Design a protein around this ligand. Structure first.
Ligand SMILES: C[C@H](NC(=O)c1c[nH]c2ncc(C3CC3)nc12)C(C)(C)C
Ligand SMILES: NC(=O)Nc1ccccc1
Length: 276
């Protein structure tokens, strides 16, 4: 669980976001290039706010044990060591393998993401940044939730979180209560999950992406988006989307957070659709 920095060999950049980077490294204590590959997250900001957030991120991921959550491996002293999943993010996987993945497969991914989120909720963890770009592909038939950089643990007596600073994620995954009042909860995660369902069933095609649809539907973008959503406007059924899948999307997009189904309620429904 403790990795020596001298043994972590830099290979390439895997991603960035906020004030951290993820690097592909080889953990190579023999120094002969035979060591295993790992993904390593580090900060680039000395600011105590970020460092405290990163410390919290590590504690959260360390305590998460799920087949559907990216595996914590350890730390180096400053760096968070995780498993490396070469298939990359689901967003890119969907775009690339579009012609191989049928509706059953998409429903399988949906079910696995749902189960991870059900576990996350059981730990009082709000993810806050659920999106296909933050889901990793373990194999053809196995996805895992990643990117816990914005994740928060809910106090025992409170089921929601209010953030001071404005969000920095693409605005089309945010629940209306997050857009308007910076309110995040397990139910705003459900809203975002609705958008993930949309991404899955569009195969993250750019031309019908959440952004592309908003520019079509048409004063600040965030205010406009809030208005559209308040009016009851929603993303359209993806091309060839099963009706039942689209219905579940719309339920995830219930305007009031209390009217959205829970992940535990969504799970059996997705399993039923996958079997059917
Ligand atoms: C860069 C982040 N990646 C990670 O934290 C990762 C943890 N293990 C990984 N394995 C592969 C990848 C390829 C997609 C680059 N990313 C990660 C994010 C979740 C946003 C894709
Ligand atoms: N949840 C949802 O429907 N979001 C949305 C609506 C219109 C345009 C872009 C995104």
């Amino acid at each position: 669980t403790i990795f020596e920095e001298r043994h972590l060999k830099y290979i390439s950049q895997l991603g960035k976001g906020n004030f951290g980077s993820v690097e592909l490294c080889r953990y190579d204590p023999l120094g002969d290039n035979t060591g295993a590959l790992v993904a390593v997250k580090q900060l680039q900001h000395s600011g105590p706010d970020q460092q405290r957030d990163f410390q919290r991120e590590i504690q959260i991921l360390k305590a998460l044990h799920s087949d559907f959550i990216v595996k914590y491996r350890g730390v180096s002293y400053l760096r968070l060591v995780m498993e490396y999943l070469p298939s990359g993010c689901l967003r890119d996987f969907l775009q690339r393998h579009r012609a191989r993945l049928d509706a059953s497969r998409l429903l399988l991914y949906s079910s696995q993401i749902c189960k991870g989120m059900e576990y996350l909720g059981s730990r009082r963890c709000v993810h806050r940044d659920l999106a296909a770009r933050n889901i990793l592909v373990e194999s053809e038939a196995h996805v895992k939730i990643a990117d816990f950089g914005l994740a928060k643990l809910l106090p025992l007596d409170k089921d929601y979180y209010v953030v001071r600073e404005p969000g920095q994620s693409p605005i089309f995954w945010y629940a209306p209560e997050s857009l308007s009042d910076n309110i995040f909860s397990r139910q705003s995660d459900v809203w975002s999950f609705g958008v993930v369902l949309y991404e899955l069933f569009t195969y993250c095609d750019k031309s019908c992406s959440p952004s592309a649809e908003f520019l079509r539907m048409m004063v600040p973008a965030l205010s406009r988006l809030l208005e559209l959503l308040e009016e009851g406007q929603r993303l359209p059924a993806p091309p060839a989307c099963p009706a039942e899948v689209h219905e579940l999307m719309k339920l995830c997009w219930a305007p009031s957070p209390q009217d959205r189904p829970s992940f535990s309620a969504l799970g059996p429904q997705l399993d039923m659709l996958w079997s059917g």
